[PDB]
Amino acid sequence: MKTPLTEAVSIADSQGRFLSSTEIQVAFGRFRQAKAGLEAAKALTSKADSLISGAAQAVYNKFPYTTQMQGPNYAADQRGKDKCARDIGYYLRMVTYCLIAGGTGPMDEYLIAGIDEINRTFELSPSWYIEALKYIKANHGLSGDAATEANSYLDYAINALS
Amino acid sequence: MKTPLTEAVSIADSQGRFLSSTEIQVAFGRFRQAKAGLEAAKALTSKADSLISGAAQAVYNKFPYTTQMQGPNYAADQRGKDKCARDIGYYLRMVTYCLIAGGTGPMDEYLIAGIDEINRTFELSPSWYIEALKYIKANHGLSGDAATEANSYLDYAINALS
Amino acid sequence: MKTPLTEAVSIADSQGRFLSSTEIQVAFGRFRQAKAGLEAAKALTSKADSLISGAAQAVYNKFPYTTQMQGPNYAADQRGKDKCARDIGYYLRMVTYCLIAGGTGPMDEYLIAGIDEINRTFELSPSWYIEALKYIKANHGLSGDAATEANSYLDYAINALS
Amino acid sequence: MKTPLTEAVSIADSQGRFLSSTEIQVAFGRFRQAKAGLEAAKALTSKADSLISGAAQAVYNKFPYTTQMQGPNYAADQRGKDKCARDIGYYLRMVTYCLIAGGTGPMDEYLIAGIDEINRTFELSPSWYIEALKYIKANHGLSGDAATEANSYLDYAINALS
Amino acid sequence: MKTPLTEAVSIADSQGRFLSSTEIQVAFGRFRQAKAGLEAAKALTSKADSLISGAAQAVYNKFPYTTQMQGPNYAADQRGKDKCARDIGYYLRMVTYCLIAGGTGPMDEYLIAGIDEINRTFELSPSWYIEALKYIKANHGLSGDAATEANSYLDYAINALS
Amino acid sequence: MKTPLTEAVSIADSQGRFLSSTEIQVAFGRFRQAKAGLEAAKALTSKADSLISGAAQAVYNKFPYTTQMQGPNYAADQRGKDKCARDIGYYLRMVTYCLIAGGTGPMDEYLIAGIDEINRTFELSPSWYIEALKYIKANHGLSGDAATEANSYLDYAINALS
Amino acid sequence: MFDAFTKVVSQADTRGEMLSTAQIDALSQMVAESNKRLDAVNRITSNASTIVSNAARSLFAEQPQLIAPGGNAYTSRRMAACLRDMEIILRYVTYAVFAGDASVLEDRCLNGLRETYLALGTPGSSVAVGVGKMKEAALAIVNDPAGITPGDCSALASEIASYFDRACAAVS
Amino acid sequence: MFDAFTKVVSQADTRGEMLSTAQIDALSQMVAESNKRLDAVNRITSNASTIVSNAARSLFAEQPQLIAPGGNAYTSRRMAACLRDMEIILRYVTYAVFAGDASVLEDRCLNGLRETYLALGTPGSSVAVGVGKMKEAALAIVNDPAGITPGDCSALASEIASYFDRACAAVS
Amino acid sequence: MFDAFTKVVSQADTRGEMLSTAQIDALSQMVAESNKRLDAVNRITSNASTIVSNAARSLFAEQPQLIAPGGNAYTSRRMAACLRDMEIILRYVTYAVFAGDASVLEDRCLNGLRETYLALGTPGSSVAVGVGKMKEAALAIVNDPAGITPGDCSALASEIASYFDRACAAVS
Amino acid sequence: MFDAFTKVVSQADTRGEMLSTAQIDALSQMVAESNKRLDAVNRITSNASTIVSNAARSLFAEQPQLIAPGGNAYTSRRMAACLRDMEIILRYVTYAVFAGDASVLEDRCLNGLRETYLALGTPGSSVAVGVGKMKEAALAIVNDPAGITPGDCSALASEIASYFDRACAAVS
Amino acid sequence: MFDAFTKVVSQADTRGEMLSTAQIDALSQMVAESNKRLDAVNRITSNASTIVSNAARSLFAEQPQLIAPGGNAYTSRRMAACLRDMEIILRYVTYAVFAGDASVLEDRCLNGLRETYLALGTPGSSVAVGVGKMKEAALAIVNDPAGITPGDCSALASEIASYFDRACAAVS
Amino acid sequence: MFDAFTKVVSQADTRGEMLSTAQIDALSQMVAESNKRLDAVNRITSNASTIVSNAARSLFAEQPQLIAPGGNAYTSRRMAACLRDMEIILRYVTYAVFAGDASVLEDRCLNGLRETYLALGTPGSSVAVGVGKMKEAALAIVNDPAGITPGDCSALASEIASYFDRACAAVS
Numbered sequence A, B, C, D, E, F: 001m002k003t004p005l006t007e008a009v010s011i012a013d014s015q016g017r018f019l020s021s022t023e024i025q026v027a028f029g030r031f032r033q034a035k036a037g038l039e040a041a042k043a044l045t046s047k048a049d050s051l052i053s054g055a056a057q058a059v060y061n062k063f064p065y066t067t068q069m070q071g072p073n074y075a076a077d078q079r080g081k082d083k084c085a086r087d088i089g090y091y092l093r094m095v096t097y098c099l100i101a102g103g104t105g106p107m108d109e110y111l112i113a114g115i116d117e118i119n120r121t122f123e124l125s126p127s128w129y130i131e132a133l134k135y136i137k138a139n140h141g142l143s144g145d146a147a148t149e150a151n152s153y154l155d156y157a158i159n160a161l162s
Numbered sequence G, H, I, J, K, L: 001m002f003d004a005f006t007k008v009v010s011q012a013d014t015r016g017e018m019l020s021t022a023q024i025d026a027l028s029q030m031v032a033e034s035n036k037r038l039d040a041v042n043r044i045t046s047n048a049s050t051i052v053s054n055a056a057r058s059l060f061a062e063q064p065q066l067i068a069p070g071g072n073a074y075t076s077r078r079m080a081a082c083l084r085d086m087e088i089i090l091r092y093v094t095y096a097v098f099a100g101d102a103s104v105l106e107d108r109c110l111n112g113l114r115e116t117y118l119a120l121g122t123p124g125s126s127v128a129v130g131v132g133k134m135k136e137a138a139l140a141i142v143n144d145p146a147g148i149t150p151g152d153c154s155a156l157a158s159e160i161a162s163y164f165d166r167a168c169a170a171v172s
C-alpha cells in the first residue's frame, strides 16, 4: 500500500531502524498535502453521479460501436451500460481513496493489480477507460494543488492502461 | 546515504516505478524543513569553536580522569586534547551535514559505521562522546524547528553510542 | 524452444543422460507428423496473399471503426492498412513455421513473447487479430491432420490473445 | 518416471502451459511404439522362466568361481543360486515394464537407483549381471521393433552397470 | 561450542564421515591436556575468593573513579561493588570451565557472545575487566601447562574486550 | 584435506577465528602421534617390495581365475600382473602418506575419490583389492601405535571399497 | 504422477508380478483409441479461454454476491486470481485426460485445495459451480461431430466428466 | 499494514463506498493534531536507549531471578537478546504511533510472539513487565511540558498507551 | 547515489570542511525553486506512456530497418525490450530531476550500458535518437504555460536536458 | 551437542557454580581411561562395513517380508536407504562413544526418527532388531583381546551398549 | 539450440520469409531418412560404455605419460574426470545426431572447452586422440549390417563423423 | 592449503614416490621442536589486539596523511576496515606458523591483495609499513625469555619472520 506514512514505516523497518528526521519530514509533507487532498476528495464525491454519467457518454460518443454491437463486452443494452457506469464509478472512487491516503496505494491494490488479465479476458478495451479518465480530468472543475494531485492519479491510471 | 530525496528514489527504483504523489510529498516535507536545517547548520558552523572547545571541556569536567591518566587513549597531554577536540569537531561537522541534507545519511556513512570497532580498539569510552553531544545540545542556542532537528541528530549519535 | 526434437534433447540434457527409447518415440511422433505438416505449410504458403487480404477485410468488416478512426493505431489510411496486413502476414508466417517445426516454438519466440506489452503500448486490440485468425481457420482449405495441426496453432494464438 | 506421457505432462506443467501439438506428437509416438512394445512384453513373459534359469546358468558357467567360493555374495549353495535367479528375474521383469511404459522409468525407479550401493555393500559383481543381460538379448528370440526396443532396455541396464 | 571433542565430531558429521585417525589424535591431544587442565581448574576454584576480591580491588586502584561516581554503572555503593565482584567472579568461573572443557567454548557461549551489547547498553568499560583479568593472570600462582592454558583463556577474554 | 593440522586451521578460518587452545591441543595430538607414524611409514617403505609382491600373490591365490581369464581387466598376462602390482603399490604408498600426514587425506584425495567409477568402468573387483589390503595388515610386521594407525588406514580403504 | 501405463506397472511391481495378458490387452484397448483421447485434449485446450471466460461470466451472473463490493471476486486482483483458478483446474484436467490417469490432477491441483479456499474464505461451493459449467462446455466441445472422423467417444466422455467431477468434489 | 488514512479507505472499499463527509472530517481532525503525534514519535525515539536501558535495569532489579544463574536473561547472549526484544517492541510501538494504526505492531511484531517465547522458555509475563515499564517512561517523556509549545496531548497519550498495552497483552 | 544536498556534503567531507556560506546559499536557492522542479517531475511522469510510445513510433518511422525482419527491434520480444529501455531511461532521467543530481542515472542506468548493447548487437546509437525524441517531447511538456503559476523554468529545463543528453552520450 | 566435559559444565553454569569435587573426578576417570574409549571408536569404525552388512543380512533372512516385493526394503532405492539408516545410526553411536555423551546421537539422529518411520510406513520394530544385531557385533569387536594391550573394558562395554539401546528404544 | 527444422526456420525468419518449396522438400527428404537417424542414435547410445572405455584404454596405452604419476589422468579423481569428459562429448554428439544440427554440441559442450583445458593444464591434443577413437568405433557400430534392415547410411555416417570432428577441432 | 606434512606428501605423489628416509628424519626433527612452534602461535595470538593497535597507531603517527580528511583511513568505516586488514594479515600469518607452511597465507590472504588495493586506492606501501611493525612486535613477544622453558627458537623466529615478509612483499 503506497502512501507516505506507510512507506516511511516500511523502509525504516526493512532497515531495522527507528524513525528519524527523514520519516518525520515525510509525515510533514503528507499532513500538509492532506488538506488540499481531503477537500479534493469531497469535491469529486459531490459531483460523482455527474462525472460518471458524463464520462460514460463521452466514451459512448467517441466509440459509438460500444452502444451498438451486441456482445457482452459492450453496452448496447442496459446491462452493459450499468457495468460501464459501475466500472467508471470504480475508477472515480479509487481516485478519491488515493487523495485521502495521499498515494496510489488504494488504486494499485484494488484496481490496477490484475486489470490487464481482466481487460484481456473479457475483451474490454483500455481505450474506453482512458477516454473516461480524460473526461473526468477535463470536468472535475478543481484547481490549485487539489487539481494537480487528482490529475496525477487520473494520469497514473491512464499510464497503467497504456 | 539516508535522506528524504535519495530514499524516495531508492523506494521507487526498488519497485521499478516512476515517482508519484507519494515521493513528491516526501520532497515537499524535505523542502519545507530545509529552512530549519540550513539555518541550524549555518548557526552551528559560525559557533563551532566555542561549541567544540566547550564540549571538550564538558567531558573533561564530567570525567576528570581523562585528563590525568597517561594512556594514549586519554587527553592528559596536548596530543590527547587535540585528538579529542578533533573528534568532537567531527561529530559537530557531521551534525551540520545531516541538517544540510535533512537526514542521518552523512553521519551514518562517515562516522557511525564502524565507530564501535574504533572505540573498542583504541579504548575510547562512548560515554565521553555522549557528554560532549549533551553539551552541544544545551549550548547551540537555536530555537524552534532548527533546534528540534539539530537535537534529533545529536540524540541520534547519542543513541548510536548507547 | 517448444518442438518435439528440441524438448526431447533439452529434457535429457537437464537430466544429464543419453537419449533413450522415450526420446526416440518423440522423434517417431514428430517425423510421422512432419509429413502432413510440411504439406500444410506449402498449402498455406501458396495461398498466403489471399488469406492475408481476406483476413484483413474480415477484421475491418467486424470492426468498421478501425478503418475510420484517425489515430496511428488504426487503419484509416494506407499506412495503417499496410501495418495491419503486415501483422496478419506475420501471424500466418509464424503458423507455417510451427507446422515446419511441429511445435509452437517459433511463434512463442518470435511473436507471442512480449505481444501483450506491444498491444498495450500501441493500443492495438487483441480482438482485431482474433477475428483475423478465425478467418484464416475458416478459409485455409486444409483438411485431415494438416488442418488439425494448423488450427491448433491458430487457436493457440487466439488463446494467448484472450 | 521417464516415460513419454509422463515427461510430456511434466514438461508442460513445469512450464505452466496447456499441452500443445508437441506433447500430442510425443503421445502419437508412444502409442505407435506401444503396439510393438506390448507384444514384446507378452513374448518375454511367456518365455520368462526359461530366460531366467538359462541366464543364471550362463553366468555360473562363464564365472565358475561364483559357485565355488563360500561367501554369502556367491552361489555355492541353493540360497545363493536362488538369490541370483531372483535378481535376474528382477531385471527381466523391469524390461517388460519398460516395454509397457515406453521408457526406462520403471527400471530407473525400482532397480537402477541405488543399485551401485547394493552391489558394493553386498559385494556383487556388476559383471555377473551383464552376462545375464547379454544372454537374454541373445535368447529372447524377438524380431522387428519388439527386439530393438527390448534390447535398448537390456543395453541400458548393461550401460548402468559398466 | 569450541572444544576439542565437540569440534572433532562436528567436522566429521558435517562431512558425513565416521571418525578416523585425525579426530582420534584430536582426542589424544585433548586428553593429554586435560590432566593438567582439570587440576588447574581445581587450583583456581580453591582460591576464587582471593582472586576475585583481589582483581576487583585491582580495578578500583587503576580506575579510582569507579568508586566515586554515583551512576548505577559504577561501584561507589555496595550494590555496585557487588555487581563488579559478581562480574569478575563470572570471568573466573568461565576460565575454569574452559580449562575443564579444553576450549574457549563455554566462555564464548555464556559470556563473550553479546558482551559488547551489554557493556555498551549499561556503559560498562571493557578496560575495567581487562585489568581484572591481568590481575588473575599474575596472581593465580599456576605453573607449567596449567598456567599456559589458563593464561590463554584470560588473554582470549582480554582480546575480545579490545 | 583430512589431517589434524589442516583441519584445525580450516575450522578456525571457517569461523574467522585466531587459533586457540583447542587447535593447539589438536596439534599436540598430531605431533605426539607423529613419532610412531613416521617410523611406521619408514618401516612399510623398507619392505614395500615383499609386501606388494606378497599381497598380489594373496589375491591370485584367493581369486585364481584372475590369472587365467583373457580380458584386459585380468592378470593372465604380464601386462595385467604389472597393472595389478602397480595398483597394490599405489595403495601401500597412500598408506605411508596417511601415516606421514596423520590422516586419511592423501588417500581420500589421490585414490578414494572416484575409485568407484574406475573399478566399474574397467571392471575391476573391489574384492581383489580388499584381499591385498588384508594381506598387508597381517604382514607389515609393525607394532604398537605404528601398527594401530597403519591398520586404521588399511581398514579405512577396505571400508571405502565395501 | 502416473500415466495409464505406469499406473498398472507400479501396482504390478508391488506384487512383484509381470502384467497378465488381461491387463496388457486392456492397455492395448486404450492404445487403439488414443486418437480420440488426443482429439479431446486438443479440442478442450484449443478452447480454454472461451471455456473459462464463458463459465466465469455465467457464474458471476448467477451469483452476483461474488462480484458485489466486498465479495470474494471483488477487486481486480481477486477477479484475476479467480479466473486463474478456473484455468488452472481446466489445465490439470486436460493433463489427466492426456495421461489417462487422474493422479496428476489429484496430486498437483486438488490435494489440499479445500483447505486453501477455507483458509482464504473463498466459497468452494461457488468454485464447484464454475467447474461444472466448464465441464458442460468442455464435453459439448469434445462431442461436436463437426470436422472430425465420426465415431464413439462415449467412454472417453465419461472419463473426462469424472475428472471434472473429482475437481468439484475436491473443493465442495 | 495500514496507516490511519488507509484503515478508513479499506473499510469503505469493502462496502464499495466513498468516504462520507463525517469520515473525511474525522481524518482532517487527525491531520490538525499531527504535529503533536510527530513530537511524541521524535521524543520516544530520541530517548530510546534511555527508555530501554532504564526499563531493563528496573526489570532485573524487580525480578532478580531473571539475571540469577539459570535465569532467562542470564549469560551475555540471552541478556543481549532480551535488550534486543525491548528495543524491537519499542521500535514497533513508535511505528504504530507514527502510522496512527496498530496494524504494523500487530502483524510484524506481536503476531505469534507469545508462541515464540513459549517455545524458547522465555517468561512472557516478565517481558510484559519490561514493556509496561517502558510505557510509563515513554509516556512521561511524551508528556513532559519542557521545551515544547504548551497544549493538550491527552488523546494521543491514550493512543500511545493502547499500543504499549497491546504489546503487554500479546506476550502474557 | 547522491541528491543535490549529499553531493555537496560528500565534496565537503573530502576536504574535512563544513559547507561555506556560498554553498549554503546555493542549496537554499534550489530549495526556493523546488516547486518548479516537482512540477517538472509530475508533468513528465504524468505523460510517460505518451512520451515513450510517441518517441518509439517516430524512431521506427525514421528507421524502418529496426522493425524490418532481421532488425534489432523485430519480433515481439525484442520490440518489448526496446520499449522497456525507453521507459527505463525516462524513469531514471526523472529520478535525476527529482534528486537534483545525475548520479542515480549514471550509476544505475548508463554505466556499462554501451557494453550491454555492443554484446547484444543492439544499435545503441538508435537508442540515442529515441532518447533525443523523448527529450524534446518532455521539455515541451514541462514548458507548457497553461494550467500553472507563470514563471521562468529556463534553468530547470536546461538541467533536465542535460540528464537526457547524458543518456544519449552513454550509448552513443 | 555436548561432550562429557561440556555436559557437566552446562549443568554447573545453570547453578552458577564451579564444578564440585565429585564432578571433576568423574571427568578425571574418563581422561585416565580415554585410551580404551578411543580404541573402541577405532575398532567399531574399522569394521563399519561388516557390522552394517552382516546385521542387515541377518535382519532380512530373519524377516523376508522386508525384501519381498511390496516390502519396505524392496526395490534398490529403499534397500539403499535402509542400509544407509543402519550406517547412519552406527555412525552416531560411535560419535556418542567418542564424546562420552549421548546428546549428539539423541539430537541429530534419534530425535524425531520414530515419527519419520511412522509417516513412511517403515517398521521401526524391524529397525530395532537391526540395531540390536549391530550392537552385539560391535561389542564383540570391542572386546576382542587380540591385537591390543590387555585390560578391562567392561565399563566402556556398558556405555557403548546403552547408546545402542537408546537407538532401539527410539524407534521401537 | 536448433534442430534440423528450427534451424531453417530461424534463417527464414531473419529474412522475414516463408520457406520455399525447395527448402521444404529438402526437409521432407531428411524426414524420409529419419529411421536411419534414430538407429544411429540408439546404436551409439546402447554401446556408450564400450566406446568410452575401449577408447580411453587405447589412449592411455598409447600415451603412458597421461597415467604415469604426475600425469593429467593420474589419481582416481582425475581418471574419473577424464572418463567423464569422454562420455560427455559422446553424449552431446548423439544429441547433435538426434536433432540433426550441431548447435547443441557447439553451444553446450564445445564452446569454451579449449580454454578450460588450457587453464587446467589438460592436453587438448590427447583429448582429440581419445575423441577420434570413439568416432571410429562409433561409426563401425552404426555401419554394422547385422540385425538391421539393409540400406544406405553413408550420408548419415558422413554427418555423424562431422560432429565428432567438430569436437576434435574444438579442443585441438 | 598444505601443512608441513602434506606439503611433502603432495610433492611425493606427483613423483609417485614414497618419502626417502632422510626426508622422514627431517619431519621427525620438526616434530621434535613442535612445542616451540605452538608457544609462538599461543604468544602471538594472545597479544593479537595490542600487536594490531600499537602498530596501527604508530603507522598513523608516521603517516598522518592516512587519517587526515580525504585520507584512505579517514571515516570510521575506512579506519575499521584498515584495522581489520591488519588483524586479518596477522591471523593468516599465525595460521602459517601453526601449519608450518605458507600456503594458507599465500592462497587465502596475499593472492590478489595487491590488485584489491590498487583498485581501491589503498596505498600498499603503507600497509607494508604496518605489517613490518606487527612483525617486529610479534617477534619480540616470541623471543621473550620470561615465563618459558629456556631454549633456542632462532630457527622458528626466522620462519615466522619469513611469513611477515611474504605479506609485505605481496602489497609493496
Ligand SMILES: *[C@@H](C)[C@H]1/C(=C/c2[nH]c(/C=C3N=C(/C=C4\NC(=O)C(CC)=C4C)C(C)=C\3CCC(=O)O)c(CCC(=O)O)c2C)NC(=O)[C@@H]1C
Pocket: E144, E145, E146, E148, E149, E152, F021, F024, F025, L032, L033, L034, L035, L036, L037, L038, L039, L040, L042, L142, L143, L144, L145, L148, L149, L150, L151, L152, L153, L156
Ligand atoms: C621460543 C618460542 C621461546 C621458547 C620456547 C620453548 N618452549 C618449550 C616447551 C614447551 N612448550 C609448551 C607449550 C604449551 N603447553 C601448553 O599447555 C600450551 C597451551 C595449550 C602450550 C602452547 C609445552 C607443553 C612445552 C614442554 C614442557 C615445558 O614447559 O618445557 C621449550 C623446551 C623444549 C621443547 O621443544 O620442548 C622451549 C625452548 N623458549 C625460549 O627461551 C623462547 C624465547
